[PDB]
Amino acid sequence: GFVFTTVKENPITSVKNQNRAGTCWCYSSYSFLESELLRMGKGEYDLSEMFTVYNTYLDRADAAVRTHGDVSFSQGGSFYDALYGMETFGLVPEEEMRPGMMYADTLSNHTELSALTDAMVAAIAKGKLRKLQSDENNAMLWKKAVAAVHQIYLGVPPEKFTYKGKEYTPKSFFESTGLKASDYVSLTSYTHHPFYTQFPLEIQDNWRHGMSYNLPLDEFMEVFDNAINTGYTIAWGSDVSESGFTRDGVAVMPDDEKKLNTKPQPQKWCTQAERQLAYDNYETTDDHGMQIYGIAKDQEGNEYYMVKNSWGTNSKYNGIWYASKAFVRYKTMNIVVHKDALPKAIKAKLGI
Amino acid sequence: GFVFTTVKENPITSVKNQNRAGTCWCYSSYSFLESELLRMGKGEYDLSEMFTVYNTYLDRADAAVRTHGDVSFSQGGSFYDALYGMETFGLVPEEEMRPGMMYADTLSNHTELSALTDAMVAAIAKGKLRKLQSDENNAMLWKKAVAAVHQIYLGVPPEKFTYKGKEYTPKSFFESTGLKASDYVSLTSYTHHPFYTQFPLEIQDNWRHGMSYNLPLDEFMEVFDNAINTGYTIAWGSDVSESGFTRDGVAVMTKPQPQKWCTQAERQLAYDNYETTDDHGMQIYGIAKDQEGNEYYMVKNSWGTNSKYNGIWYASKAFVRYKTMNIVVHKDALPKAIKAKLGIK
Amino acid sequence: GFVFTTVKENPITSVKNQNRAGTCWCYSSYSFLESELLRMGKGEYDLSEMFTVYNTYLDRADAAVRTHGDVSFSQGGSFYDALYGMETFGLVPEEEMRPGMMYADTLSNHTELSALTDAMVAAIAKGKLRKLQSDENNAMLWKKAVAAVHQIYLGVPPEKFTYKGKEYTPKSFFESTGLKASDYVSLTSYTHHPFYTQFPLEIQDNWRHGMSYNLPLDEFMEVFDNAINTGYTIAWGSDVSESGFTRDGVAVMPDDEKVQELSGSDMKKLNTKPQPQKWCTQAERQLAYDNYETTDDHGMQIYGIAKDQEGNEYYMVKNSWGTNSKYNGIWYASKAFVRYKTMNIVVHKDALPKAIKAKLGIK
Amino acid sequence: EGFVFTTVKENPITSVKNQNRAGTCWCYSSYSFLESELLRMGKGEYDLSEMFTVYNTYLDRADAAVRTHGDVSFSQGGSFYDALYGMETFGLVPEEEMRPGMMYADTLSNHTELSALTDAMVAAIAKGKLRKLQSDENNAMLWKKAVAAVHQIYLGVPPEKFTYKGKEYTPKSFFESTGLKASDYVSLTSYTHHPFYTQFPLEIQDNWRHGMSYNLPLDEFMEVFDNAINTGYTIAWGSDVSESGFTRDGVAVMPDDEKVQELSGSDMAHWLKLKPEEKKLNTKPQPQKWCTQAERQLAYDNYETTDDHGMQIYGIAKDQEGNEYYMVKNSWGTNSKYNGIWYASKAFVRYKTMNIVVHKDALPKAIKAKLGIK
Amino acid sequence: EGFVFTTVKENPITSVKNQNRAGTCWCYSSYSFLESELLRMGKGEYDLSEMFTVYNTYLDRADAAVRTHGDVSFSQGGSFYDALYGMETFGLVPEEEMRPGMMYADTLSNHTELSALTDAMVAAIAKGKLRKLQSDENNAMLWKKAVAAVHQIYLGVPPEKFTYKGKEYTPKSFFESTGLKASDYVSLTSYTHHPFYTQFPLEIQDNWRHGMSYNLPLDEFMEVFDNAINTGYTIAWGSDVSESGFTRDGVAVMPDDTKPQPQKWCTQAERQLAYDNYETTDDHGMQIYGIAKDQEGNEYYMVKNSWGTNSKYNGIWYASKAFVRYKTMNIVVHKDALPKAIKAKLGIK
Ligand SMILES: *CC(=O)CNC(=O)CCCC[C@H]1SC[C@@H]2NC(=O)N[C@@H]21
Ligand SMILES: *CC(=O)CNC(=O)CCCC[C@H]1SC[C@@H]2NC(=O)N[C@@H]21
Ligand SMILES: *CC(=O)CNC(=O)CCCC[C@H]1SC[C@@H]2NC(=O)N[C@@H]21
Ligand SMILES: *CC(=O)CNC(=O)CCCC[C@H]1SC[C@@H]2NC(=O)N[C@@H]21
Ligand SMILES: *CC(=O)CNC(=O)CCCC[C@H]1SC[C@@H]2NC(=O)N[C@@H]21
């Protein structure tokens, strides 16, 4: 087994539990932004994923119907979904739309919701209907249907609510936090687009085509180490379907110089080409969005990152995993950080 | 019946025949680009659609695979594929890659090609393979195979060739035309996005997600008339499915009758409810009048010349107002006032 | 445990490794033809399976398309595919067409290749196309595509090559053998055809419909023991998906009844130690073939005879699964198991007993 | 302005039969041919039972599908070789002993429900998940009993003995009394994916028995048709009939579209948009395309010539303009312009024939020798 | 040891039977029940042929699938009502005149191949595109001949006449010699999507005959169990057993989330939700024939199953009264097993 010492942490909020839903993109976004609110000085916040999970789905439904089934309709999503939704739909406190409130529960189970809405969206998007029906205001009946089924399972979005004495709209509540989409940028590292460029990652949950900035794998890993040591958290989207990623709370990248996962061992540090290949050949897919809040060493001096997951606190380190550098550099798909976490030099190469 | 008289037309090249493939996007784009080369004094070109179709399908296959099948793999394309293609792949003359050359024909029939390539792309993009194979230089084998099958049915793309006594590459040939993708804007008119912004049209053949400037409908149609009256032609993407231009070479809303002039909401309705779909690409190159004063855009099609007007036909202004999905024009074809509200230099 | 003593074995070449492809039919065929070349005093050969696997698949694709999908398109095959191929396509040394060279590997993994080529062949053979395309010389476009894809994953087969100071074509390299397909006969033992006649085994991988001579099962086993005691090896096709065939190197047909006669009324060691064996009648063997218990013609090579502690007789088999097994790629198949589960064998004509040869009309 | 035919020479045939709603042409054409053969050999008029042979053939085809795990398709078709092998293996019985339709109050076959049931039964065995098929204490397969029982329910119980014109027979002894011999008959084809003057099994689905055909150059292959007819023999004729030239009105022609378009008035561009009724391509005598060995090969290779239909060629005729046709006895009843007879132009036969069976003595002597047929 | 049981009161059962590889629990449990009824009525021990009844019921179930164009599923299951209707309609035969496995050289059922063919045959008629099924000159349907002939090939020829303990019978006259009457048995259930003291057909796929059950409030429903056992009757017991764990130790018990543990005692509504939300399905048929207690005094119904005797209690096992109350779907008892007052509340004379 492993024993880990913390080298450096930055404040996070409590550990949340997405339970039975592919909502990691939203719980990790909010985990990341809550940490940002703490460091900006706004106090502790608990935002409602269910509210923008709800709204993102209706748009995605619309996108699947426009593209006649090309845009897959599924539970997942992106960091960009949250940043966009925040400026578009607003934000509400968790208290106004909690997981599981409609089926006598306290945590999400979205399996039946998906069974119904997947079939509905597919009956429109991939069926044989030649002319979809609308009302006298040209509003579509199938979107009423889809939105109504989502509210039956997720709750009805508040149009107005009271929070800590003052009443809000989701927009004005969003303005109360003082977050701006522009402050944060998405970064990645691949060779099938030129470096220091903008491209939308070619993954199904990026159906909105959110753009990402493209660094070489060594500058890319310098923003991670810089962001931590200057006091920032990172929204970390990565591939966690790996023999190295454990349910015992550790994500390593063992070598063949060696019980590869159970005890500390030499790490395999990847070139840029070995890494691009894994994304081209399906060994690296957009599995999971989490939050990395700092740095640590194990009992042999090997270096790891402190990640906060969205699976509750029933695990070896109460819902926290340790992700090794060799793992984070091989299998990261994108990270969203705030601009001020970039080094000056890295920021400079094509960056305001 | 209809009797038309031309009001104004700008030069076009000859009518081509796409035959049996859904390559209208490329054929119309090249009719539009060739007209542009005439406008700019560069003379008459016949560009190879097959060459651009070839390279576009390879990128579409890679998009299908990367998105695990979400990007459909089909014969279709957009005006942006041709514009992106020329800057990315270059151009070659017609005779360097002709339709039908590999199966003893002179016109396209891509049904077998699609049947084989559709099955290969899906076996990768929607199968169960978890580690796709690569050579010792990290080049993917499935890409080699999809390209190899495309070459067997469409031809080996030239790396160099001689054209009117001068040697080129596809890149240096394109450079010799002086065309710039930066000169062309895409325009559309819808209410599910704000006017005077850019969004990418939500249609399966825009898998590259090329942006269009969104204009209110009355100004959208001002661009049509202004482009034609000042010497430009128009790359024209529209739903022709229900139009009945198959019967007489005319599209209306068989005698001249008053056209229902659509509002912005009725036209947004048809797009939202699937009545306006299957974006077909052609070229608008003039304005004509029927014997009762009604107004039509003259359309160059890519279905050959065995039709009532020898491959051209007429689309009433109203029809074009209702069923257009996007157009591509030179920047200089936009009126000064409209151009300024979009930030276009 | 098991302890084995060799009674008589005949030289084989080294144990090869087919890895992740259903190409046992070709590796076993070549294990047998290389043992043949050794026994004709021609030296140790390593013929290229990939060259023959490549050409076999193009024929098999053509058979699928001509029959509109009835001939299944898959990775398997038969000994006849190899003897047909040696005389139709030629032969090349291993070095000219290696497993895995196209995808930075040293052993085969044909899963992605099959993924692609199964889908292409099915798009033609089971699709709705009414007029396949062809070029100015009437050569079919689909065939070219299929061939180009096989080349990308397996290799470009050589037109000419140099081997030990001499240069060859695959054809001329095969004439360099002295091997003649007419020298080898296929034998089986079933009762849905009369004995001493020829019929094509009704199995999917016999899509060329190679004939086999049908023997009574007792004379069928005589051929085994004579072939081998007289110096020959056997190309051995049988079903190995049985309780008795194990990954621990043993293939037994144990009589579960006479085992459970010793010390119990059981509710344990039926394959991990010498045991009594069921000796099948011609009828029980027919039943398992009729009822799907004997299937999946897996190909291997028999080269030796051995006994265990209690004198039971076993055939020594050379597998094509590598050398990380209990006996470094060698299995032991009891004579009872072979008699029950064999689908067909190929031997040289002169390995037959004289009366068996005369009864089958073999010159 | 249609077709008017005059017979040049035809040889005796029995009456036109009607296979109706079943894919049994192979056995109907085979028995049209064998009945002409018995007439030719002086044995008189027979009406052999197709249903008997269809019944036993499908049981063999079911077994083939099961042994090959569904590779051998199970469907209604068949081959000439099915019937020749059949007469020597199962025997023959007279029509009266197993009539079409008799089990479902009908006089003509409708095998749609029989196929619906037995295709589904055969596929449940051959392509399903069963790992050990069941057997009784004599090792007979239960699935074969079930498939036999359902075939008997829709087609009838085959006789083991019957009386015919005062004499009791079994199927085998009735076959023996006709004096037919399968070894008297040869199958011939003409393709180039195998060398000439060899035998190979045509690679088509209904040849699941892999019956062989002798391969001839196209011109020699056509000489056989003529020599057979002109010396008193008839021809079992396996052909593609899915062509615009093969019509419901008793004609099979192979027009040269270019030529007809040049005889006509309109140029190429107008003609492409002319009316099919105005083209008159299949309704009057027209110049024929006369294919090469290679064009014939390409159509087989490329799916334009498929194994569609078995019939009997028994004569040679001319139309009012002197063009030549083979006379074809079909098996679809007599409600058609020529009472169930088709006239197939020589061009059509040369281009779309898949294989033929004739008695060995129908072969021209020099061709017989090239084939090694003694 | 975990569970140690003491019998409080059990009623005579015949030997434990083995349905082996077929979903014929409905018929084996029906006959366990009816054989106990025969013992109770003083007629002695019988061994009735499930295969005879299974054969005739599938031919009816195939007809029901064909008439509803595939809505009635065709599968191996069935109901107690199938057996009660069957005995009045087809008769009964002794086990020896139609044994499991006899046609394929076994002694136990394996109906996998039989289903593979007959499922495919029934679907080809009921779900295909045939517009006019074929009939003979007497208007008997050929597809029914086909399906009948295939069932006989795998299950045997049903006897028309046979001799048993020295007397010759037909299936009907053997049934009459037992003295059993379908009218003597009532079907009971407990749900709230229909009113209490009414009859309705349970909405489960194996009740394609739409046999009616009387609906009782849960407490009165359990009172019938105890009354039947304590006055000497047994119970045809249909319930969900899927997630119960009886396989491991012979014991079905109610999870509060090996050893006797506290049992959640469900309400009518808790029991209703599980039938509405799919937690209670796969009605499995067995026989309850006694009452037992464990070492700590908790009470169980004794269950006779039909899977042979290679289990911890030799084919018998124990269900807590709480499990039985939560997971039972329907029961059949003789009318005289009902308390007088429940009898009156349902109008049963
Ligand atoms: C990025 C994500 O949210 C996916 N990561 C997760 O941890 C969620 C997956 C857990 C598996 C659950 S969700 C869907 C499925 N249905 C169910 O009842 N359990 C499964
Ligand atoms: C915008 C497009 O290209 C679709 N428009 C067309 O005009 C395509 C027309 C050719 C029709 C061909 S395509 C595939 C199909 N297969 C065939 O043999 N004819 C059809
Ligand atoms: C006669 C044969 O070759 C049958 N197969 C073997 O002997 C062992 C190799 C099969 C294992 C491979 S085949 C295709 C499949 N795909 C994969 O990755 N492993 C499997
Ligand atoms: C060689 C053949 O027998 C091909 N078929 C024919 O020549 C005539 C058959 C007409 C098509 C019938 S068969 C079965 C199907 N069911 C129906 O009602 N009509 C179809
Ligand atoms: C109410 C029932 O009969 C379901 N209960 C059972 O005990 C049936 C389970 C036996 C398992 C057999 S039956 C069908 C399936 N096919 C097979 O070969 N084993 C399975």
Ligand SMILES: [K+]
């Ligand atoms: K939260």
Ligand SMILES: [K+]
């Ligand atoms: K992975």
Ligand SMILES: [K+]
């Ligand atoms: K062109």
Ligand SMILES: [K+]
């Ligand atoms: K080798």
Ligand SMILES: [K+]
């Ligand atoms: K087996």
Ligand SMILES: [K+]
């Ligand atoms: K007849």
Ligand SMILES: [K+]
């Ligand atoms: K045809």
Ligand SMILES: [K+]
């Ligand atoms: K019984």
Ligand SMILES: [K+]
């Ligand atoms: K349950």
